[PDB]
Amino acid sequence: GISRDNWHKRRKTGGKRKPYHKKRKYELGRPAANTKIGPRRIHTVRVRGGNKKYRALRLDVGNFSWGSECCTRKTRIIDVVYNASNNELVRTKTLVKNCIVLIDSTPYRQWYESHYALPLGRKKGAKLTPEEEEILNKKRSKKIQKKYDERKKNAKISSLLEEQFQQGKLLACIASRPGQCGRADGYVLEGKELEFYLRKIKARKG
Amino acid sequence: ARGPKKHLKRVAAPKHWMLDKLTGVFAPRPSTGPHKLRECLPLIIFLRNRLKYALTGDEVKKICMQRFIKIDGKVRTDITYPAGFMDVISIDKTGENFRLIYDTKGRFAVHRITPEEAKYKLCKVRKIFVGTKGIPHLVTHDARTIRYPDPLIKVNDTIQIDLETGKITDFIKFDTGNLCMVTGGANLGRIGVITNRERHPGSFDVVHVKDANGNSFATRLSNIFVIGKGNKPWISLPRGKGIRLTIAEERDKRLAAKQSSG
Amino acid sequence: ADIQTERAYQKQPTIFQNKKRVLLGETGKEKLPRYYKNIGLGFKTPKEAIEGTYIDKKCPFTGNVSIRGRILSGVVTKMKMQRTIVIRRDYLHYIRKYNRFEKRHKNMSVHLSPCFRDVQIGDIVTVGECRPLSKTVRFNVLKVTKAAGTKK
RNA sequence: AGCCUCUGGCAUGUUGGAACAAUGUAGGUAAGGGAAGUCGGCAAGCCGGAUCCGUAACUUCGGGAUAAGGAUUGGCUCUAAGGGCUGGGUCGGUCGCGGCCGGCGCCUAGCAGCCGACUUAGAACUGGUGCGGACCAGGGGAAUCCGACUGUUUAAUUAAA
RNA sequence: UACCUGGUUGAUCCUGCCAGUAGCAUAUGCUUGUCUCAAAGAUUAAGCCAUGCAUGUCUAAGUACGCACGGCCGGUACAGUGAAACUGCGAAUGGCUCAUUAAAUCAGUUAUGGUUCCUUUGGUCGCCCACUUGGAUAACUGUGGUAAUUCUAGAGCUAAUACAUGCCGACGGGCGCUGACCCCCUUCGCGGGGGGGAUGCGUGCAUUUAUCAGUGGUGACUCUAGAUAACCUCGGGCCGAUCGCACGCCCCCCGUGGCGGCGACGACCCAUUCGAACGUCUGCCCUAUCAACUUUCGAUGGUAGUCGCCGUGCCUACCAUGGUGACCACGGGUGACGGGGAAUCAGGGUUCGAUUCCGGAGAGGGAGCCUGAGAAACGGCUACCACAUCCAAGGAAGGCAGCA
RNA sequence: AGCGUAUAUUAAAGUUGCUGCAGUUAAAAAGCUCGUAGUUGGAUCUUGGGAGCGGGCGUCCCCGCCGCCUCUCGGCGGGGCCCGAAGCAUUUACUUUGAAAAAAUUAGAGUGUUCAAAGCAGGCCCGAGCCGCCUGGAUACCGCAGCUAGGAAUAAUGGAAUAGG
RNA sequence: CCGCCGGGCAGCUUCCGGGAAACCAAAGUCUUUGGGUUCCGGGGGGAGUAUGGUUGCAAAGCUGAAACUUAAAGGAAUUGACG
RNA sequence: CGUCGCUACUACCGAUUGGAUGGUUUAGUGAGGCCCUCGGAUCGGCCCCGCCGGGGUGCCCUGGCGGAGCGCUGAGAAGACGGUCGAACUUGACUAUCUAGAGGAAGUAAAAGUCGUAACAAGGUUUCCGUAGGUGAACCUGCGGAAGGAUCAUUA
Ligand SMILES: [Mg+2]
Ligand SMILES: [Mg+2]
Ligand SMILES: [Mg+2]
Ligand SMILES: [Mg+2]
Ligand SMILES: [Mg+2]
Ligand SMILES: [Mg+2]
Ligand SMILES: [Mg+2]
Ligand SMILES: [Mg+2]
Ligand SMILES: [Mg+2]
Ligand SMILES: [Mg+2]
Ligand SMILES: [Mg+2]
Ligand SMILES: [Mg+2]
Ligand SMILES: [Mg+2]
Ligand SMILES: [Mg+2]
Ligand SMILES: [Mg+2]
Ligand SMILES: [Mg+2]
Ligand SMILES: [Mg+2]
Ligand SMILES: [Mg+2]
Ligand SMILES: [Mg+2]
Ligand SMILES: [Mg+2]
Ligand SMILES: [Mg+2]
Ligand SMILES: [Mg+2]
Ligand SMILES: [Mg+2]
Ligand SMILES: [Mg+2]
Ligand SMILES: [Mg+2]
Ligand SMILES: [Mg+2]
Ligand SMILES: [Mg+2]
């Protein structure tokens, strides 16, 4: 099949290696996952060792995190943005390690709105007034008010994130191998990271 | 090759299950075990070749599957189960129980011990582990791991293991001044107190060793397994006591014992 | 400037960098806390490794590589690649017949971390055997000494 | 270039109507074979544009040479790659958004916005393998004879040596 | 044993060769009383092959209801030998040969902190079916084809450690964060301090991702270990909670509940053992009538990726424009599988090493494949190519470089 | 009891010459010169001397000593004591000692195989009442490269000079 | 004219020592074998041929094989003997 | 010594886009596997009803016999779209090796034919090198060389 060997290609100088053996089950290459975004679809593979390998071909959701806040709700991966390697993998919406992806904000919103109890985006008073104060309005007080006033200033977000939550989509980057692992795990692009990738996107579209 | 190799040619067979060129093509091959193939004694060689207890291979088959032979007090039916530095090998219907100490030439003895001294046993240590939840692990040279060791046991030291329990009972750090048998190379089954070791980064470390008579061999660390606090080996030694006599001396001393002996 | 030039973002992993809701400007003064290591065998992890703004995974003074085996030296002959040079190891291979030697050499491509500045050709350089790092390159430069010959 | 069209020009090149015979003169097309055809491949067709690949003997070392021999070529939706023009002297003062002074700045790695021709490369998708679809458009090779090459010549039968 | 003798010339001394000499290495020429050791179709043709064989396996311990035979004896399911069949292993070693292969095999040396590992050893294993739930095939029984094969049609049964499933367990008990809340001290009250909290959600050995802190271990952690947040590779993680033969017991106690030895398969974390693998440094035959090679068909490198077991131009994309060379590359050749050795030999070499020991490769040739820990496996198969058998002309079966 | 010829190959070959050939005439030194790789390259740098022990009042052979630095580093409220670290052996080349070097082969210990090629056993103790003793399965080499430790004879190589320790 | 000195062209002479010999201050320092280094020969012919490459306008130049055949060809000196 | 004469053997040149095998491969075509996307012989299970029986509180839990939605997950063959390694086949290129060949020209054998007589003696013309030109053949002649001479001198 589709081997992985130093056995065939030229030497440093530029002489052509002769063969040696046949291809052995060894320098074995399987074809790619080039995993998409759809309802979940993963085949197992039997590999060397015994052991197994979770090659994702359709993949919808990721277990993937704030840096700073120190959480990681499991969230839908909405859509691929740019992938530094190559610009088919964007268009085809192929998730691979260090793809930049849009995701659902919603599960991250909904634990400030537990924890520090201060909103995101900006709104007039439609969701906020029935439900945030349903998270707030205390009849315990004293201990708790002290507690998420100790969760002080620093229920704070960078403008760059604050923005995205209007939209209900966050920029994140894959750090697992969908084809090897079986998942599309990652971090949220946060702070410095977050600033090319916007400026890449902006400069790319023009 | 394709798989792993389940076979051993006589000749290729190391120098000490002491086999001869005629009589066969193959040698016995240690079945996989705790001890490395090259530093073994497959039980089979004791019986027919060392003790002349059996004669053939089938004679030995009929021995071990009566279930007499107990390699460290745990009964083996494998004719080719590997023994190696620091084992026991109790026969029980006989009451002999040997070790497996190597001679001064490095070729595993027929050295009988008491019924006592078949409980205590020695083992060098290969690593500290820290397994999980902070439960620390040893790895003895005979591939025992032993959980829950005294934290002062470090690497290359030896342990005075029991047997029926497993467990540990008191021990010898690897300082200067303690007693060493050598378990690899040339100075092999030769015995003496240390002196001084030479730490090198990267390449493995050298150990200078002085003996009774005053002959300094050195060795790589990974061959030295220790046997006492200093001029007091806890085990019984083989006759000769890993002193090693120059062929000149050995020749004459053997021959000088002769004539005067009667 | 300088650092993030390529396409993907280049960052020392095992430093997560952001958390800040306090005064004292914005971020620290080092700003990014820099992951570096001591390598071993006593070679001083140089100043520009620790000081440096820079980033190369294949540098042992600022990234994931282990040095672990055979330490050699050679001379720098070409610096026309980027983060790699070519060194040239000279010797006498001995014939026994002809009771004499002949000069030989096996030039050897080798990683050169850009911490390690002001290198030139005709430059004595010491190298560690590394992980098989590219196709040819298994070695990584550890201490340049510029020594024999010429000037400061 | 060819071919289709506006401006401008005609009204089919000294007649018309009706059929579609043979011979013609102009155009076309043929199963299978494929020069067997004649003095001879006489006419025609093969080739034909571009992009990519590729290239002989021989030599006057220029050539040969588009040698030879191959691949690709549509529509569509994309991507990538090729440029101009203007903008910091901000801070303070003072003078009338403007100037002047002085000070800091000094993108001196630039970045920001605003313009405008064109090209070229690559990737999907896609169509009964169609794509230089109308037209434009070198058949090739191996030899010998002659004449170094360009040119010229018998206006109305010889263009060649 | 450091070694020589014949031959050019009417005669001489040389250069120089020819010819002798001995061993070794292979031909066969003749002869052959004894006895001990002992090589053998390698060179040519990895050319071809008739036939005969070279790889099966049962303890007590995975199923056994063949009537096979007894038992010894039954009715209670067993009992005990036991032909078949499923299942688990092996078949991945060995054996053969050297076609290829010139830094390629391979030696020594080092690395794996750039990895996998059946087995053995050592360990480690408590979150309403468990008093085991379901279901389905082989032998077996019967009815079937085909000319023919180690070809099956089809109807009944019936096992399991084969295939699925999935429960007691543990403590409405304990500890992480949430907490309906509550009390006391202090305060004008806000507030400050001390407390205590029903009820939620969590309630892990492994997984992947994210973060945090700095018991033990190295020259060498970006390691082990620990803390927080998550997920489920999900049927295709594991254990989690697995099944046989010996059948031997004790109960503040009468029949239950506890217990005993053996095995088998699990397995997760792990170690270990046989390894396997891919790297380091340094090491080879001839040839210039081979001087430049290498590079959008990866050449060398950077970045980011895919694939794998893993680092890696293993592959893709985008960048750079590199790397080798007369210390002879690059090109060509070999009557080249590589070592360990051999016969020769004053010291130094010279050629041979297909040769039993080690290392490599291939089973007409390539490629791809299943299966498997482990193979790209040839005593498997899939075609093709290259070979070739039987034929009822529809079809079928072919691989000696196992031994003969 | 072997002995013949077939040819490959080694000595013989001081006829491939490193050791170690040859170049007036015998086969043979470019027509001459320049010149990049290569090979090759003067001299010159710690010594005489000291202190002792030991052979042949002193003289003349023969040995351990006067690697330096560090103590910035360990420790076998202020310590020493010096090992632990490194300046590191300028940077090698060189030499010597270790360690590592699969067995078989080889070299070669041991052994009435009846000898020998071989074999690795055998030997013994024993009238067998011992109901059993005793010993082996020696060692050297194992290129180059790699690893370790001594030495500094020679060969390169380095350091202060538009100033620096 | 008579000396000396450096380096030049040369001569004679000799049992240094070389040298098969002729001869040679050097062809000396060589089995008492190696100061440095360049080239280059390995019986004679075939053959400086064929072929290949290259330079040249070309004569040709440079690089440069084999099958085959062949026993001596040759060198230095001795007597001869014939010019 | 050479042409010339005859015979024998080698290799050479040689018109023949001469033939054969091997190795690369440019171009096309491309078996089968492998992956991906579909598919869906079928086979269930879940279920929904009709009727009936046993157990429980018209309803539920089991059982029996019928029917139907074939609702919705599972398994799931044949098959098909794509992609990847890729033997194989077809046409070019190179290089390797090996050979067929009308006729032409050397050498050698080799060794006793004819015509001379080039060389060795002052070889009758000192010899030889290189170059050139010539010639039946050795050859000859220019020019410049050489002595390996037939003169180490020519007698201020
Ligand atoms: Mg020599
Ligand atoms: Mg008309
Ligand atoms: Mg008109
Ligand atoms: Mg026709
Ligand atoms: Mg005709
Ligand atoms: Mg025409
Ligand atoms: Mg032409
Ligand atoms: Mg003309
Ligand atoms: Mg005319
Ligand atoms: Mg003689
Ligand atoms: Mg004679
Ligand atoms: Mg001879
Ligand atoms: Mg094998
Ligand atoms: Mg291992
Ligand atoms: Mg050949
Ligand atoms: Mg065959
Ligand atoms: Mg194979
Ligand atoms: Mg195969
Ligand atoms: Mg076979
Ligand atoms: Mg010879
Ligand atoms: Mg000799
Ligand atoms: Mg000679
Ligand atoms: Mg001269
Ligand atoms: Mg001479
Ligand atoms: Mg000499
Ligand atoms: Mg010759
Ligand atoms: Mg002459």
Q: By the 8 A CB rule, do B219 and B207 touch?
A: yes
Nucleotide nearest to A145 (CA to C1'): E191
Q: By the 8 A CB rule, do B219 and B205 touch?
A: no
Shared-domain flag, residues A96 and A130: no
- Phi and psi at residue A89, in whole multiples of 5°? -70, -20
Beta-strand ranges (E) seen in chain A are 41-43, 46-47, 50-52, 55-58, 61-63, 74-83, 99-104, 169-174, 186-188
Beta-strand ranges (E) seen in B141-258 are 158-161, 171-172, 179-182, 191-198, 206-210, 217-220, 224-228
The amino acid present at B156, given as its one-letter code, is N
The amino acid present at C94, given as its one-letter code, is Y
State the residue for tokens 């697992």: A176
Shared-domain flag, residues A1 and A37: no
Shared-domain flag, residues A96 and A36: yes
Shared-domain flag, residues B26 and B40: yes
Long-range contact pairs involving A106-111 (C-beta distance under 8 Å, separation at least 24): A106/A75, A106/A168, A107/A73, A107/A74, A107/A75, A108/A66, A108/A69, A108/A71, A108/A73, A108/A75, A108/A165, A108/A170, A108/A188, A109/A165, A109/A168, A111/A71, A111/A73
State which nucleotides on strand D lie below 7 Å from a protein beta carbon.
78-80, 109, 123
Shared-domain flag, residues A101 and A48: yes
Shared-domain flag, residues A100 and A183: yes
Burial class, B209, CB count within 10 angstroms (exposed 0-12 / middle 13-18 / buried 19+)? buried
Shared-domain flag, residues B110 and B125: no
Torsion of CA A66, A69, A74, A76, to 10 degrees: -50
Burial class, C84, CB count within 10 angstroms (exposed 0-12 / middle 13-18 / buried 19+)? buried
End-to-end CA distance of chain C: 30
Domain assignment of residue B249, yes or no: no
Neighbours of B62 (CB within 10 A): 11
Kindly report the CA angle at B44 between B40 and B50, in degrees rounded to 5?
A: 85
Shared-domain flag, residues A113 and A178: no
Contacts of A196 in chain C (CB under 8 A): 4, 9
Task: Please give the Cα distance from A57 to A53 (Å, whole number).
Answer: 13
Domain that holds residue A85: 31-105+169-206
Strand E contact with C11 (CB < 7 A): no
Q: DSSP 3-state assignment of A53?
A: coil
Strand H contact with A25 (CB < 7 A): no
Q: By the 8 A CB rule, do B77 and B65 touch?
A: yes
Report CA A70 to chain centroid distance, whole Å.
Answer: 15
Neighbours of A3 (CB within 10 A): 13
Domain that holds residue B62: 1-116
Chain B interface includes C40 (CB < 8 A): yes
Supply B121's token pair.
């046993």
Domain tally for chain A?
A: 3
Shared-domain flag, residues A123 and A184: no
**Measured between CA atoms, how close is C70 to chain B, in angstroms?**
9
> Which technique was the structure solved with, according to the deposited record?
cryo-EM
Q: How would you classify the pairing of strands C101-111 and C139-144? A: parallel
Shared-domain flag, residues A160 and A178: no
Beta-strand ranges (E) seen in C34-138 are 71-78, 84-94, 101-111, 124-129
Beta bridge partners of A79: A102
Closest by alpha carbon to A160, among A137, A136, A132, A188? Answer: A188
Shared-domain flag, residues A131 and A173: no
Shared-domain flag, residues A180 and A133: no
* Closest partner CB to A192 (pick from C17, C109, C135): C17
Helix axes A159-167, A192-205, angle to 10 degrees: 60
Which sign does the torsion angle of CA B10, B13, B17, B21 carry? Answer: positive
Supply A92's token pair.
């085809």
Supply B170's token pair.
């008191």
Among chain A residues 108-147, those with CB within 7 Å of any atom of strand E? 139-147
For residue B36, the CA-to-ligand 17 centroid distance in Å is 29
Torsion of CA A135, A136, A142, A147, to 10 degrees: 70
Q: By the 8 A CB rule, do B104 and B242 touch?
A: yes
Shared-domain flag, residues B166 and B179: no
Shared-domain flag, residues A59 and A75: yes
Task: Tell me the C-alpha to C-alpha distance, in Å, between residue B195 and each of B97, B177, C73.
Answer: 34, 6, 35
Q: By the 8 A CB rule, do B207 and B220 touch?
A: yes
Shared-domain flag, residues B2 and B55: yes
Domain assignment of residue B259, yes or no: no
Residues in chain B: 262
Query: What kind and span of H or E run contains C143?
Result: strand C139-144
Beta bridge partners of B125: B140
Domain tally for chain B?
A: 3
